[PDB]
Amino acid sequence: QIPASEQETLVRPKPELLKLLKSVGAQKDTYTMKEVLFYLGQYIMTKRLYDEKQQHIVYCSNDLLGDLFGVPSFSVKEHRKIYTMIYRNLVVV
Ligand SMILES: O=C(NCCN1CCOCC1)c1[nH]c2cc(Cl)ccc2c1-c1c(-c2ccccc2)ncn1Cc1ccc(Cl)cc1
Q: In CATH, what number is assigned to the domain containing residue 77? A: 1.10.245.10
Q: Which domain holds residue 2?
A: 1-93
In whole angstroms, what is the distance from residue 92 CA to residue 73 CA? 26
Way it was determined: X-ray
Most informative mutation of 44, 48, 88 for ligand 1 (most atoms within 8 A of CB): 44
Which stretches within 1-93 are classed as H helix? 4-7, 15-23, 33-46, 64-69, 79-87
Q: Total structural domains in the chain?
A: 1
Q: Which amino acid is at 42?
A: Q
Resolution in A: 1.9
Contact 12, 30 (CB under 8 A): yes
Residue 48, phi-psi category: left (phi > 0), alpha (psi -120 to 50), beta (remainder): left
Contact 93, 11 (CB under 8 A): yes
The sign of the dihedral angle between the CA atoms of 19, 23, 25, 31 is: negative
Q: Which helix (H) or strand (E) holds 87?
A: helix 79-87
3 state DSSP class of 23: helix
Most informative mutation of 76, 82, 87, 88 for ligand 1 (most atoms within 8 A of CB): 76
